[PDB]
């Protein structure tokens, strides 16, 4: 099979900028190449065919170039709606093959995360479990570090993290971190602490609670 390689997994551009997505074919496919745009959760739509021909209705800000094995989709005057995945498709030979896609990120102003920590519910404790949840919401850029502390000392196991896609309305990122203990372990300690380190400050954002409080 002809392998289509999009070596860039993510890209970032400010509104008004010009950005380019690359797509490499393992064999010569001439000009038989299409580009697609897939917004989050939405259905993918065709942008370019024959390497450089715009599909009807596509703004002229989208241009395609290349032939043989190296292809480039260029997005001029980047708009907010362009937040999406872009992937190429070869149709020089059957079976048709696709690239894995490249997600376009929108640049925006730095923003520190809003951190909230939540103790285990009495419902979960009734069943013998104890999950502590920390939300780190609406920050930029995407890189962030979370550290859990129990009675002041770092805790590494039992932690599961989840990250959101870039928000389509404010271009921020959010993250959820859950520390799961058994009730037995949880009731043997006092202080539970979530610590967020983000490039906007050397000082981590610290949220904590005590099994004492109320």
């Amino acid at each position: 099979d002809i392998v289509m390689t999009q070596s860039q997994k993510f890209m970032s551009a400010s509104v008004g900028d010009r950005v380019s997505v690359t797509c490499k074919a393992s064999q010569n496919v001439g000009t038989h190449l299409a580009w697609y745009q897939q917004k989050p959760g939405q259905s993918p739509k065709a942008l370019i065919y024959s390497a450089s021909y715009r599909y009807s209705g596509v703004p002229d800000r989208f241009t395609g170039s290349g032939s043989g094995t190296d292809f480039t989709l260029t997005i001029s005057n980047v708009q907010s709606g362009d937040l999406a995945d872009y992937f190429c498709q070869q149709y020089n030979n059957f079976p048709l093959t696709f690239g894995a896609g490249t997600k376009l990120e929108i640049k925006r102003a730095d923003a520190a995360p809003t951190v909230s920590i939540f103790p285990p519910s009495s419902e979960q404790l009734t069943s013998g479990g104890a999950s502590v949840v920390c939300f780190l919401n609406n920050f930029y850029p995407k890189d962030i570090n979370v550290k859990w502390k129990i009675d002041g000392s770092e805790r590494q196991n039992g932690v599961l993290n989840s990250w959101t896609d870039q928000d389509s309305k404010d271009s921020t990122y959010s993250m959820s971190s859950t520390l799961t203990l058994t009730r037995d372990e949880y009731e043997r300690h006092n202080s539970y602490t979530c610590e967020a380190t983000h490039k906007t400050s050397t000082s981590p954002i610290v949220k904590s609670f005590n099994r004492n409080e109320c």
């Binding site: 992937f87 149709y91 939300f135 599961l160």
Partner: protein, 224 residues
């Protein structure tokens, strides 16, 4: 408007077979090829095959030789793909798409796509979720806004549906992708509202897990 409507999600035990459908409107059903593509999480799209309704011509990717077969009923404008002897690697989203009209250049791209049909193949058994309220620390809430949460723990398979106040609360919501551990998923969701909005006014997460035929509403209560 030209449209492709695909059938709903499927949960199959390995060894079974499944047949999903793709209803095409509104155009000449026999004038375009119907294409089928597979998307596993973490993988790129894979082309399965194509069928020309009416003429019944069929082409398949060799990698799916004995796995997928296609059919197209021209009286109902519906194309079908059947998958045999299901395994874990067949768990994916499956899209049908229309092959764009082309001339001598043979521009074989897709000009309309369906929304996709999720197929989950597993021997693990469906487990309904526990829904846990996340209320803020008993201490203070100085800020102008308060964040509440809902933890959906220990269900299988995906997906769950989570809303806040029956969907009337959409701004300030972050629902995080589920995490898999062992054979069970865990899902969290946060909502941020004005401090004057809670606890004076109720806030409830609504969770639906169709595979277990379960719905749960959890009102977030102040802890004291």
């Amino acid at each position: 408007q030209v449209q492709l409507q695909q059938s709903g999600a499927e949960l199959m035990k390995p060894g079974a077979s499944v047949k999903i459908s793709c209803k095409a409107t509104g155009y000449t059903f026999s004038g375009h090829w119907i294409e089928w593509v597979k998307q596993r999480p973490g993988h790129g799209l894979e082309w399965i095959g194509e069928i020309l309704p009416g003429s019944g011509n069929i082409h398949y990717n060799e990698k799916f030789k004995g796995k997928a077969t296609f059919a197209a009923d021209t009286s109902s404008n519906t194309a079908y793909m059947q998958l045999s002897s299901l395994t874990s690697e067949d768990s994916a989203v499956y899209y049908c798409a229309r092959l764009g009209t082309t001339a001598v250049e043979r521009d074989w791209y897709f000009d309309v796509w369906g929304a996709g049909t999720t197929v989950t193949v597993s021997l693990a058994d469906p487990s309904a979720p526990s829904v846990y309220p996340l209320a803020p620390v008993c201490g203070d809430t100085t800020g102008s806004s308060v964040t509440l949460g809902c933890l959906v723990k220990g269900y299988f398979p995906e997906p769950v549906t989570l809303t806040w106040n029956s969907g009337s609360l959409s701004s300030g919501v972050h629902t995080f992708p589920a995490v898999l551990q062992s054979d069970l998923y865990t899902l969290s969701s946060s909502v941020t509202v004005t401090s004057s909005t809670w606890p004076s006014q109720s806030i409830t997460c609504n969770v639906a897990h169709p595979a277990s035929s379960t719905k749960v509403d959890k009102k977030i209560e102040p802890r004291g």
